[PDB]
Write a protein that binds this ligand. Structure first.
Ligand SMILES: NS(=O)(=O)c1ccc(C(=O)N2CCCN(Cc3ccccc3)CC2)cc1
Ligand SMILES: [Zn+2]
Length: 257
């Protein structure tokens, strides 16, 4: 099965997922000097006041915080998007060391981690249909640097002990994803893909310019999670990031000067 090890990591994925070498793969390096300011891009509309978190799951590659996406409760609109995208889950990618862990890079700079808030286009009715469309998903990406603690992350950090191993889940109600956002919603946007198999080319990527700060202790707790199932040999869940992929025939647009 695919993963992040020497034998099943990102350089292997193309053998089961040939779209790995496709024309719109993610993540990418964001060259801040070559990104073009698009004054036609709208402010992002992040409407998370009615968000309903349900559960947190260790899926063997990350943990997902899942949301009730059966009504317009937590939606992303505006920016480069046409129509209404519902929040279904967020998860993170992180490193074994503070100098690596993000999937996107900014002028080749790696951040300690990256948050992905995953949303699907309501005109396609469900997430399974949306991932089959070139405009099916909108993923809001937010960089994490190590510094001050992020208070709004701590409820996530404190439950991870209960989902240490693959297939473990825990109730995770009344979590407010607004506490994970930076002050600025300035962004870069480009068309891309899922960053894990099946690597579908269904994502409008929206990557915030402003990172959030998390403490060394918060990201240390991410690194105590396991890729393996209970009773299987312990392999720390670290370095669950795909490296930057070729930009090919794509332009990254900036919402800001
Ligand atoms: N890193 S990320 O780019 O933000 C990101 C990567 C993967 C997902 C994701 O949802 N998965 C797990 C589920 C399977 N689906 C596809 C599917 C194929 C057949 C029936 C149903 C769904 C896509 C991969 C989401 C976001
Ligand atoms: Zn992701």
């Amino acid at each position: 099965h695919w993963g992040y090890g020497k034998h099943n990591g990102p350089e292997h994925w193309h053998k089961d997922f040939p779209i790995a070498k496709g024309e719109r793969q993610s993540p990418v390096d964001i060259d801040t000097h070559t990104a073009k300011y698009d004054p036609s891009l709208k402010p992002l509309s992040v409407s998370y006041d009615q968000a309903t978190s349900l559960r947190i799951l260790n899926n063997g590659h990350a943990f997902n915080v899942e949301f009730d996406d059966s009504q317009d409760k937590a939606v992303l609109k505006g920016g480069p998007l046409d129509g209404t995208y519902r929040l279904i889950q967020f998860h993170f990618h992180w490193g074994s060391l503070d100098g690596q862990g993000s999937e996107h890079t900014v002028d080749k700079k790696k951040y300690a981690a990256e948050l992905h808030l995953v949303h699907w286009n309501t005109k396609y009715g469900d997430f399974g249909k949306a991932v089959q469309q070139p405009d099916g998903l909108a993923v809001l990406g937010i960089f994490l640097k190590v510094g001050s603690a992020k208070p709004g992350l701590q409820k996530v950090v404190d439950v991870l002990d209960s989902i240490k191993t693959k297939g473990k889940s825990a109730d995770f109600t009344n979590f407010d994803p607004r506490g994970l956002l930076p002050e600025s919603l300035d962004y870069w946007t480009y068309p891309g893909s899922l960053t894990t198999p099946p690597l579908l080319e269904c994502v409008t990527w929206i990557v915030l310019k402003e990172p959030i700060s998390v403490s060394s202790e918060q990201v240390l707790k991410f690194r105590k999670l396991n890729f393996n199932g209970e009773g299987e040999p312990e392999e720390l869940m670290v370095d669950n990031w795909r490296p930057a992929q070729p930009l090919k025939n794509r332009q990254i647009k900036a919402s800001f000067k």
